[PDB]
Design an enzyme around this catalytic site. Structure first.
Site, PDB file in Angstrom:
ATOM      1  N   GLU A   1       7.013   5.101  -0.148  1.00  0.00           N
ATOM      2  CA  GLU A   1       6.926   4.400   1.122  1.00  0.00           C
ATOM      3  C   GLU A   1       7.577   3.020   1.030  1.00  0.00           C
ATOM      4  O   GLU A   1       8.257   2.625   1.975  1.00  0.00           O
ATOM      5  CB  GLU A   1       5.473   4.339   1.575  1.00  0.00           C
ATOM      6  N   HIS A   2       7.453   2.347  -0.129  1.00  0.00           N
ATOM      7  CA  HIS A   2       8.042   1.023  -0.333  1.00  0.00           C
ATOM      8  C   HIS A   2       9.561   1.136  -0.445  1.00  0.00           C
ATOM      9  O   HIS A   2      10.306   0.390   0.196  1.00  0.00           O
ATOM     10  CB  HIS A   2       7.506   0.343  -1.603  1.00  0.00           C
TER      11      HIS A   2
ATOM     12  N   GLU B   1      -0.532  -5.698  -5.382  1.00  0.00           N
ATOM     13  CA  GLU B   1      -1.331  -5.115  -4.313  1.00  0.00           C
ATOM     14  C   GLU B   1      -2.671  -4.643  -4.868  1.00  0.00           C
ATOM     15  O   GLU B   1      -3.661  -4.645  -4.148  1.00  0.00           O
ATOM     16  CB  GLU B   1      -0.629  -3.905  -3.702  1.00  0.00           C
TER      17      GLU B   1
ATOM     18  N   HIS C   1       2.878   6.547  -2.380  1.00  0.00           N
ATOM     19  CA  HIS C   1       2.786   5.195  -1.865  1.00  0.00           C
ATOM     20  C   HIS C   1       3.977   4.372  -2.341  1.00  0.00           C
ATOM     21  O   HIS C   1       4.457   3.488  -1.631  1.00  0.00           O
ATOM     22  CB  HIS C   1       1.473   4.568  -2.307  1.00  0.00           C
TER      23      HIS C   1
ATOM     24  N   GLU D   1       9.907  -3.368  -7.117  1.00  0.00           N
ATOM     25  CA  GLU D   1       8.722  -3.050  -6.320  1.00  0.00           C
ATOM     26  C   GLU D   1       7.518  -2.870  -7.234  1.00  0.00           C
ATOM     27  O   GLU D   1       6.371  -2.972  -6.803  1.00  0.00           O
ATOM     28  CB  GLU D   1       8.848  -1.713  -5.579  1.00  0.00           C
TER      29      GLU D   1
END
Lengths: 438, 124, 402, 402, 124
Positions: free
Chosen positions: A52-53, A129, A49, A122
């Site tokens: 993906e960022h 998140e 994940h 990030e």
């Protein structure tokens, strides 16, 4: 009758699959990868994940800003999502902007910078998140459902990963993950809409030819999960709506019972008080629920993975003193898949599904998602004629036999969120998985 | 018995000339001897209401019809407990004995019976 | 889409190579034509209720046997009723639409128990988004009536069964009905519509009570459920350049986990706010809107200032790169709108019901930097700016501050 | 009223010949000085809650033994706390006010269970009148903040215990407190205030955050509970002539079962509507309002047109008779305001706190027809008209229509 | 007995030097042998709550204190049914045994008792 899905391979073992539609003017091209969170261990959980960022944070050529501009200039958009077993990166564009989009996707997958400065930036975004998924109740319920059903197993882990890992993920482990997993024999380049297959194969030969092959190439959609009957209760008296999921261990993509489980799921079906037609649905549970105001909605599901699945129902209700009735009536409708279903319900569900499986594919993104999913789970796109034959093969005897081995008197995984004081303890819920009268 | 049944059978009789010639005069005398008009009731006020279907039909009455029904029931209850009969304008005249509720209950039952049928459909 | 005529009804169909057909009846009955507030929403919700040949119950049970689906929505211009089914089941769907238009029993209990409660849930779901509320409020300020009527039924102004029955008497007529068939053989649809819709009233064209008038102003909808702000600019002469300008100014990101390269997107940096520029052509007037939502009223205020600056800056000078980026983003937006069944149906519906020929995505005009900057300049120098604030309205900007 | 000073507190008292005294503490703490929306209403409602020396319960039981009464209200300028008692019970009431200002325990349970629910019922009762809502809405449009703050607490903006405690820290101070004693011996009050309010903080003068700014506009409050319309005109230089103009234009009848001879009263003939012109002086700005309520939005619209015409007609010519009628109605209005204990207290409170010397009813200026017509002319030709519509707002007039 | 009573008597003892010298050490051992800390309770969690006064005091607790009390009661119930004791951080340390509820109940009772007094006032 839809156009044929064309399929080619490259030398490295990258599959190219396309379905052209000369009636549309847009095209969705992208890369479906047979890899996701499940491929992480406990220490690097969250990596897929995280990547993906970073995929959109700049490559060896285009910087973050240049990347943004290049896509803006294309006119369409790029999108990505990571699941437990699958990662997707696609680009929706105009017909003649397809070579640009393939080039950008090839760049962000093969040649991403993963610069320490961007990792660090990030690392805060992803940390935020963790505290905002909390609002998406359906996702909270399904993540707890996987966590408990597959307790301490890879399928049980979340996609975001623990807070601890987010703070310790390095560019090294990011690079290691995508080098081990994003191999050509695990990847499918898919095009749907206004694409020429032969053009797409050429673009694949131009951009994805220097992809690593894995040492031991297994077929696409190749995987032992040990389901735990269990419950998570997240009581919150301040929430007005209860969210409840109940599931049993379901079927994998390649199970022989795959269609039988879909038919069984369609017999219970979905319901939503906000939709006008829902009070008139044929499903018995729908009728009980709507007549008695037991729920705002329910949604039957049959989620598959490579080697297991979850089959169950997701309920939402404001009726906090009759949650017991809602759960009681739901599980008594499941009992009837074992004891009572006949050709009447089975043929009705088959009728509804024969259309449903075709209706779902109503745009290029849906078509691409269908080609990509089927190629990465089954190794081939299954033609609608084959699907119509497999559905037609489901009898009432098949449904009863399946329910008697999968549902009847079996352990459930149960998640309750919200005002769930009225949800009884595990035993009383699990006792509704059988009928003493039968 | 369902109101639907009663209404359908009645319509078969009212169609047949012979049948209507012999049944309609009997039915009119029956109603006269029944004596519900002497308590200021309309025929439909007497129908059993403690049923899901009837509760739904009553909820669909227009507010005016519903308020007037409540008054007729209260008034009839007062005549009953006093052992008196209606006099004057309280007596229901034959022209006032309208089937205000029959269309509502027929619609409720139509849906209820269609639901039962459709719950038993077999794809051919 | 081969436009034709079948028994006085305009029918447009495009054959394809798919097992899935979409049939849509487009009615000239949107909210700009609404006799009483909310009636077009109620009429939309009254579609596929009890008809004389077939009950709502029977229709739903049979639709499940075909595995068909039903979609309805109301716009300012149309009511759209769409069905999605397998190609072979076309005759059934045509006949279903005929029953709805000819023989709907508009019964009071359906209105009280079925139609109005569903209409109310529909609206409450939409209003959960404060940006929806802000853009609705902005149309109300800008146009007052007609285009300024609410699209949706509200509690403060109740729709009666007589209201809905009267409106349906006007709308459900050959003059206000267009049939649009996606992946339907055009010759077959004409034959079926020609037999099924033959006995539909002819009726007359529904018209907007009064001419469209433009007004400036402010709306301050105090909610506790999120914050948003629309900055709208009413347009007296709708021109296609505003599509290019909307797409240029942009606002949403074209990429996951990014802000974006559009001026309005770059106005949100450092804030948890989103922005979207939109242009609404209504034939005789237009609305250019910029909507900003967020959790912080302070941040919304901050972005709102940058947003109006962005528009002014655009009025100064656009680069050639930026003008080409606008053409590309605008062609793409046109293409995907003609693909999406909901918007597709209304596009051909407008062509059939009015006479506004559709602009094919491949024929979308390229605007020079001169033409774009000129369009932005007119907007920056508008006499009638509209501002709708939703949420903590005491903390959101006012028109005179912008 | 003999103005004096006792231990830093301004005290005004007027002896009389009656057994009943009215003691009022006037605080510079009205809504224009509010820090958070609604705090001045909440602070008013928190008066005579639990203090450290005496519980709310004990106070009420002892007040019943004296047969005293308690009255509190909030304005845009002040919080007024009034007690009415027998003359001889003066020392008790002075000490009670001292306990409230010095020693109120602001406890969270009082806010949740006692104070906020009562504040909410207070507002709901006021809003039952749509004219109240319309005039409140008009101030909000005209001033935005300060004078544009709501007077009353609303549900959308929750006041916290820390909000109220902070505001009370500013307001409950010698610099923001005036004592007004009706039928109280002035020498006796000074002696008692001098001993009781000696240990009150000095504090500092509470001020309006920001200068008063004037704005025009519209407010459209959808209620289902009746209809009203305010037409307000913000005034940058408040002048005493607007009192005469308010009374001239009039609106209410001066005798039973009649319409009245005032221009605005005559505007209502043939309608079940009422009208009232009002002028609000706030020192640094003013508001001239005309409020029309009624059951018919059509009739309100009709009267609204006639009302604006009446004001224009006044700007043209007033007769000598009419100017004298205005002097008479205005002197009377002044006299009765100085009589009513509610308004009396705030009048001397404004003289004590602010410094605006009171104008005695016998010293009310007579305005010539020239001066009246000039004032009306200045209003008809204002750049910033405010219109607040309440009720069926789709059917009520807009500013540009008037 | 009322919390008010208990608190006042305790304050008399704590005042007297002699009394506190002999009572405070006893009270501390009593609390150690009582063993409620070994189930993770604070003393005030044990006070009887099924009375109007106590229900009112509990409703006045700040939300966080109220959520934490619910957890301590649930956790203690789970130790009780399992026949286990708290270990580690679940044991209430003496410094965590705070009288979170006492001020609320003392205010509720103060008003209740003043109301009783004032209901019996005699104008002199």
């Amino acid at each position: 009758v839809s156009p044929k899905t064309r399929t080619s391979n490259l030398k490295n073992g990258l599959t190219i699959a396309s379905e052209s539609n000369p009636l549309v003017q847009t095209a969705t091209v992208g890369v479906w990868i047979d890899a996701g969170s499940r491929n992480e261990n406990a220490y690097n959980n969250g990596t897929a994940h995280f990547f993906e960022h970073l995929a959109f944070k700049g490559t060896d050529k285009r910087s973050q800003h240049q990347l943004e501009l290049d896509i803006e200039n294309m006119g369409g958009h790029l999108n990505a999502y990571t699941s437990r077993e699958s990662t997707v990166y696609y680009a929706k564009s105009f017909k003649d902007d397809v070579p640009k989009s393939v080039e950008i996707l090839a760049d962000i997958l093969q040649h991403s910078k993963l610069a320490e400065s961007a990792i660090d930036r990030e690392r805060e975004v992803i940390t935020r998140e963790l505290e905002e998924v909390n609002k998406q109740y359906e996702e909270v319920v399904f993540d707890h459902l996987h966590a408990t059903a597959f307790m301490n197993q890879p399928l049980g882990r979340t996609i975001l990963g623990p807070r601890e890992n987010i703070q310790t993920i390095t560019n090294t482990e990011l690079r290691k993950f995508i080098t081990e997993n994003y191999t050509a024999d695990r990847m499918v380049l898919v095009g749907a809409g206004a694409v020429d297959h032969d053009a797409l194969v050429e673009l694949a030969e131009k951009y994805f030819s220097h992809l690593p092959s894995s040492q031991s190439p297994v077929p696409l959609g190749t995987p032992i999960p040990n389901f735990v009957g269990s419950e998570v209760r997240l009581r919150d008296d301040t929430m007005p709506v209860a969210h409840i999921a109940i599931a049993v261990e379901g079927v994998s993509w390649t199970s022989e019972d795959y269609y039988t489980a879909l038919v069984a799921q369609a017999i219970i079906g979905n319901y939503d008080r906000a939709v006008g037609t829902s009070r008139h649905q044929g499903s018995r549970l729908s009728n009980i629920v709507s007549e008695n105001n037991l729920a705002n909605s329910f949604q039957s599901f049959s989620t598959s993975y490579s080697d297991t699945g979850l089959w169950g129902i997701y309920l939402t209700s404001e009726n906090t003193t009759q949650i017991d009735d809602l759960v009681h009536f739901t599980l008594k409708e499941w009992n009837r898949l074992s004891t009572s279903v006949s050709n009447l319900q089975v043929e009705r569900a088959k009728s509804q599904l024969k259309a449903g499986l075709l209706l779902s594919l109503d745009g290029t993104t849906y078509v691409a998602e269908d080609i990509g999913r089927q190629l990465t789970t089954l190794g081939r796109r299954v033609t609608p004629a084959e699907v119509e034959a497999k559905l037609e093969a489901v009898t009432e005897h098949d449904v009863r036999a399946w329910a008697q081995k999968t549902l009847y008197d079996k352990d459930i995984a149960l998640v309750g969120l919200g005002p769930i004081e009225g949800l009884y303890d595990y035993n009383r819920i699990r006792n509704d998985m059988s009928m003493m009268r039968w | 018995a369902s109101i639907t049944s009663v209404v359908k059978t009645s319509e078969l009789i009212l169609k047949s000339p012979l049948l209507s010639k012999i049944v309609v005069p009997l039915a009119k005398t029956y109603v006269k001897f029944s004596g519900y008009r002497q308590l200021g009731f309309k025929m439909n006020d007497l129908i059993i209401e403690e049923t899901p279907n009837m509760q739904l039909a009553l909820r669909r009455l227009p507010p005016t019809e519903s308020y007037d029904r409540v008054y007729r029931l209260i008034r009839a209850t007062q005549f009953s407990l006093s052992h008196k009969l209606a006099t004057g304008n309280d007596i229901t005249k034959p022209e006032e004995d309208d089937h205000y509720l029959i269309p509502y209950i027929l619609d409720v039952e139509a849906e209820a019976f269609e639901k039962d049928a459709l719950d038993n459909l077999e794809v051919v | 889409f081969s436009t034709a005529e079948a028994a006085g009804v305009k029918v447009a169909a495009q054959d394809g190579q798919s097992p899935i057909s979409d049939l849509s009846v487009v009615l000239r009955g949107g909210s700009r034509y609404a006799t009483v507030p909310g009636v077009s929403h109620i009429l939309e919700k009254f579609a596929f209720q009890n008809t004389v040949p077939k009950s709502a119950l029977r229709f739903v049970r049979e639709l499940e046997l075909f595995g068909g689906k039903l979609y309805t929505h109301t716009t300012r211009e149309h009511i759209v009723l769409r069905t999605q089914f397998l190609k072979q089941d076309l005759p059934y769907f045509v006949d279903a639409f005929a029953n709805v238009l000819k023989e709907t029993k508009f019964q009071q209990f359906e209105l009280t128990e079925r139609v109005a409660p569903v209409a109310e849930l529909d609206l409450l779901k939409r209003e959960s988004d404060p940006a929806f509320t802000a853009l609705e409020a902005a149309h109300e300020v800008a146009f007052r009536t007609g285009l300024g009527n609410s699209v949706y039924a509200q509690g403060y102004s109740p729709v009666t069964l007589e209201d809905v029955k009267e409106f349906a008497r006007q709308v459900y007529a050959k003059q206000n009905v267009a049939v649009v068939g996606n992946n339907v053989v055009p010759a077959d649809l004409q034959q079926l519509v020609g037999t099924a819709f033959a006995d539909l009233q002819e009726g007359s064209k529904v018209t907007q009570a009064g001419t469209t008038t433009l007004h400036g102003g402010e709306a301050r909808v105090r909610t506790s459920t999120g914050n948003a702000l629309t900055i709208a600019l009413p347009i007296a002469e709708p021109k296609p350049v505003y599509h290019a300008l909307a797409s240029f100014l942009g606002g949403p990101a074209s990429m996951p986990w990014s802000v974006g390269a559009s001026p309005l997107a770059q106005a949100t940096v450092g804030t948890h706010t989103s922005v979207k520029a939109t242009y609404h052509n209504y034939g005789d007037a237009g609305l250019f809107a910029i909507t900003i939502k967020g959790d912080s009223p302070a941040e919304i205020s901050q972005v709102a200032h940058k947003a109006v600056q962005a528009l002014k800056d655009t009025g100064a000078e656009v680069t050639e790169e930026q003008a080409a980026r606008a053409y590309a983003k605008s062609k793409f937006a046109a293409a995907e709108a003609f693909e999406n069944p909901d918007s597709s149906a209304s596009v051909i519906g407008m062509e059939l019901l009015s006479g506004v020929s559709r602009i094919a995505p491949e024929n979308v005009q390229k605007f020079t930097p001169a033409e774009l900057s000129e369009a932005a300049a007119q907007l920056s120098a508008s006499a009638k700016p509209v501002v709708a604030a939703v949420g903590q309205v005491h903390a959101l900007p006012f028109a005179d501050e912008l």
